[PDB]
Amino acid sequence: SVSKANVPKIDVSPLFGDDQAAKMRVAQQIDAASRDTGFFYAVNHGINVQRLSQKTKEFHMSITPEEKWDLAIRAYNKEHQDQVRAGYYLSIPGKKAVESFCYLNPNFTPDHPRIQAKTPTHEVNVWPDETKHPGFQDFAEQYYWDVFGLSSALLKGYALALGKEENFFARHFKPDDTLASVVLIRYPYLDPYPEAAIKTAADGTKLSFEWHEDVSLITVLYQSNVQNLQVETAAGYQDIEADDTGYLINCGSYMAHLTNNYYKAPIHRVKWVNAERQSLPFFVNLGYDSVIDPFDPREPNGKSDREPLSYGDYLQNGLVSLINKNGQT
Ligand SMILES: CC(C)[C@@H](NC(=O)[C@H](CS)NC(=O)CCC[C@H](N)C(=O)O)C(=O)O
Ligand SMILES: [Fe+3]
């Protein structure tokens, strides 16, 4: 039938410290995972994921249709022309099961210069009413910075894994301008489950979301303990086992570009499972003007012929292409 992917659990705690040899040992494990299936679990990460899951559940379960329209992105509410990324992504009863809420850098305010200039991909977050959802915005903004901190540390591991100084990626990952997003996704239990929400893969597997590479530098994902993800290998798709204490980490296609595909962006898909669950990704994106010169770790000199790609142009094109290929979420 279907085999299981080798997804190692890596203790990332040395990446927060000052023991340089211990950091190299973490980096070696990141390298090995990135060259194998492309996924690993980050453990001993220091984030209170129990509070994350509880607060996210309380939001998803208490928000009403009125509030969802008021928060909806432009795809669901033509009045909200400025909300392409941030806001609520509605389910469609009988047709579309998944819903989610996406928010961006809390530092993007009307006062921010990228907002003043109307630069694409930058938006001001929208939030529910504090009286109906007490503490939610405070929790969500805090969480952004908590997962930002973990992601910064992981980026030091990836830099060391590739033979670079530890700030090689992290220097471009800044609180003032990061395009990183959090998505709070609800996959509901439904009976009957809408057939229109289930896709059939070429190999017959029933899916909630088709194969893709991620639009990110790396993706830092929390999920509740319901198995759903599969990664493509040359010998077919393999199941990724769930772990609701760890963060699942993989590279996105910007990492594949800048390493000349030495660290590939793994192709993965989401199997259909009729179970109430959470999927909480943090997409590690750089700043709009961030450019990293591509290199090829396989070459003594690291020379690559690939063109440098501005992160903002990469992200704008990548988000649109993912909608065109796999559907509006
Ligand atoms: C596999 C998970 C990461 C998750 N998939 C997803 O969230 C999928 C594929 S990675 N991602 C997207 O649609 C991109 C959302 C980008 C976000 N609106 C933004 O503006 O930054 C899932 O559970 O479906
Ligand atoms: Fe993905």
Curated annotation (Swiss-Prot):
Residues that bind 2-oxoglutarate: R277
Leading EC class: oxidoreductase
Cystine crosslinks: none
One Pfam family, short name: DIOX_N
GO molecular function: iron ion binding; isopenicillin-N synthase activity; L-ascorbic acid binding
Cofactor binding annotation: Binds 1 Fe(2+) ion per subunit.
Recorded coiled-coil stretches: none
EC numbers, comma separated: 1.21.3.1
Alphabetized InterPro entries for the sequence: DIOX_N, IPNS-like_FE2OG_OXY, IPNS-like_sf, Isopenicillin-N_synth_CS, Oxoglu/Fe-dep_dioxygenase_dom
Cofactor: Fe(2+)
Site (Transition state stabilizer): F209
Binding site for N-[(5S)-5-amino-5-carboxypentanoyl]-L-cysteinyl-D-valine: R85, Y89, S181, Y187, H212, D214, S279
Binding site for isopenicillin N: R85, Y89, S181, Y187, S279
Residues engaged in binding Fe(2+): H212, D214, H268
Compartment annotation: Cytoplasm, Cytosol
Keywords annotated in UniProt: Antibiotic biosynthesis, Cytoplasm, Iron, Metal-binding, Oxidoreductase, Vitamin C
Reactions this protein catalyses: N-[(5S)-5-amino-5-carboxypentanoyl]-L-cysteinyl-D-valine + O2 = isopenicillin N + 2 H2O
Span of domain Fe2OG dioxygenase: 174-286
Pathway: Antibiotic biosynthesis; penicillin G biosynthesis; penicillin G from L-alpha-aminoadipate and L-cysteine and L-valine: step 2/3
PANTHER family: 2-OXOGLUTARATE (2OG) AND FE(II)-DEPENDENT OXYGENASE SUPERFAMILY PROTEIN, OXIDOREDUCTASE, 2OG-FE II OXYGENASE FAMILY PROTEIN
Function of the protein: Isopenicillin N synthase; part of the gene cluster that mediates the biosynthesis of penicillin, the world's most important antibiotic. IpnA catalyzes the cyclization of the tripeptide N-[(5S)-5-amino-5-carboxypentanoyl]-L-cysteinyl-D-valine (LLD-ACV or ACV) to form isopenicillin N (IPN) that contains the beta-lactam nucleus. The penicillin biosynthesis occurs via 3 enzymatic steps, the first corresponding to the production of the tripeptide N-[(5S)-5-amino-5-carboxypentanoyl]-L-cysteinyl-D-valine (LLD-ACV or ACV) by the NRPS acvA.
Self-association and partners: Monomer.
Protein name: Isopenicillin N synthase
Organism: Emericella nidulans (strain FGSC A4 / ATCC 38163 / CBS 112.46 / NRRL 194 / M139) (Aspergillus nidulans)
